[PDB]
Design a binder for this molecule. Structure first.
Ligand SMILES: C=CC(C)(C)OC[C@H]1O[C@H](O[C@@H]2C3=C([C@H](C)COC(C)=O)C[C@H](O)[C@]3(C)/C=C3/[C@@H](COC)CC[C@H]3[C@@H](C)[C@H]2O)[C@H](O)[C@@H](OC(C)=O)[C@@H]1O
Ligand SMILES: C=CC(C)(C)OC[C@H]1O[C@H](O[C@@H]2C3=C([C@H](C)COC(C)=O)C[C@H](O)[C@]3(C)/C=C3/[C@@H](COC)CC[C@H]3[C@@H](C)[C@H]2O)[C@H](O)[C@@H](OC(C)=O)[C@@H]1O
Ligand SMILES: [Mg+2]
Ligand SMILES: [Mg+2]
Ligand SMILES: [Mg+2]
Ligand SMILES: [Mg+2]
Lengths: 5, 234, 234, 5
């Protein structure tokens, strides 16, 4: 669950 | 275009209504119409544009990952089930590529070319890298050229953002977040991803003392997103 | 139809894939195609059909309620904002009515007419009452005739279900749940709604002793749904 | 939050 925005 | 007969202000109004109703396909169609009126977008309008398509493509990507996982399991002892899984994965993939192409076309006609202020130019170049990145996720003769398009867009945004924005700027931070994930899972460069997330986090941390209280909720969120990725990768 | 060239079995296969991917618009299109092949649906296939359109129309209804609330607030001291809210509420409403019409047309051509077993006939008549009920939610010269269509469909399902199914049958319980809510919030008959939910719950409770363990997860869920509505209304 | 099914 790495984050991108 | 289907939105050509609607006033610009009405399109913006209705994109905000679609946001409240979580009707993101409509929201995207309204903002596409707003872009096509030919006037630059304000800051608030840029955010409506990016949120709308981020949620549309996001749902398409999640469904593409579900079907692709099923497709891969069907190619391990697995019982032949026919072409249906590949067909439906392709169907979703082609729709996804279509949205990405539509967003890249808006940026090319003519958002990036008319954006002079750093806050807009970096915002749109980040978007360009994002949607080329989404095309790369599903690419298998073409992946290399799509990957380089994404990197080139991210890199130019990076250059502008370092020269023209403070290290705490939310757009600069959000760009760095996504370009780091690009390095990690697309360009096979985890060390570059880690280095980029750490220097970005550290340089914003040093700049917090210049900031007004409660004027940087978005930057603080993104700093936690950088910290989360680092903890996951190290 | 767009699905006319696809095999029936492939359509069913792809509806199940769309379910796993939460791609409910696709799921509904695949099952519509499956219905239009002209063969009766099995039990598992009926459930795919109803879930698909329940989620499509459900999202449309939630967004319609958001916009309608904004519309009502705009007609209280409120500043004129123009026709955009009404226009976009109408847009969503017309789409919603279109889906309901499509589902009612499938039932009319020709699912209900060819359903002889109680489990299918009640299932489809419940669906008919549900989608007429959804049309009633947004109706304002026509509401009365739409309301009576819903009641007539529910009532016939009720009659069959009482004669031909045990009181614990999940379809019978789910019909009673929705017909009770129909009485409560559509037909302005809260006492009929309460009475119907209580006798339905009580008569299923008395029948539980006949049932195998873990063969009635759906019935037990719906009994809790009946109990929840009663607690809310009393 | 009445339930329907
Ligand atoms: C759809 C627009 C709405 C919901 C009205 O606003 C979205 C948000 O728009 C702004 O936040 C932006 C913004 C995000 C913020 C991180 C959200 O912050 C909080 C506290 O919720 C998420 C959005 O997706 C958005 C628009 C995207 C970008 C991203 C775009 O790349 C092309 C780069 C980083 C980030 C920047 C643009 C953020 O400034 C605002 O500063 C946010 O307000 C707060 C409390 O920080 C607001 O929630
Ligand atoms: C889309 C289909 C999938 C997800 C595969 O199955 C949905 C479900 O299909 C069946 O459940 C039906 C069913 C529902 C059950 C109450 C769900 O039960 C549990 C424990 O999750 C909800 C669904 O919407 C569905 C198909 C709808 C109806 C409803 C239809 O009116 C026209 C009447 C009541 C209810 C009946 C048909 C239920 O039997 C099964 O008995 C359920 O299995 C279990 C554990 O009970 C399964 O979850
Ligand atoms: Mg004008
Ligand atoms: Mg300019
Ligand atoms: Mg055939
Ligand atoms: Mg028959």
């Amino acid at each position: 669950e790495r984050h991108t925005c | 275009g289907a939105m050509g007969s609607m006033e610009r202000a009405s399109l913006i109004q209705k994109a905000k209504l679609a946001e409240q109703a979580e009707r993101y396909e409509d929201m995207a169609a309204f903002m596409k119409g707003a872009v096509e009126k030919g006037e630059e977008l304000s800051c608030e309008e840029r955010n409506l544009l990016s949120v709308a398509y981020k949620n549309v493509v996001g749902g398409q990507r999640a469904a593409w990952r579900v079907l692709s996982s099923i497709e891969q399991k069907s190619n391990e002892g697995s019982e032949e089930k026919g072409p249906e899984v590949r067909e439906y994965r392709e169907k979703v993939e082609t729709e996804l590529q279509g949205v990405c192409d539509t967003v890249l076309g808006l940026l090319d006609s003519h958002l990036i070319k008319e954006a002079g202020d750093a806050e807009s130019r970096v915002f749109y170049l980040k978007m360009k890298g994002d949607y080329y990145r989404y095309l790369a996720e599903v690419a298998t003769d073409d992946k290399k050229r799509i990957i380089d398009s994404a990197r080139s867009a991210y890199q130019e945004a990076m250059d502008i953002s370092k020269k023209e924005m403070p290290p705490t700027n939310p757009i600069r931070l959000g760009l760095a977040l996504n370009f780091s994930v690009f390095h990690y899972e697309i360009a096979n460069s985890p060390e570059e991803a880690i280095s980029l997330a750490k220097t970005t986090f550290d340089e914003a941390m040093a700049d917090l003392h210049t900031l007004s209280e409660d004027s940087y909720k978005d930057s603080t969120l993104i700093m936690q997103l950088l910290r989360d990725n680092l903890t996951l990768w190290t």
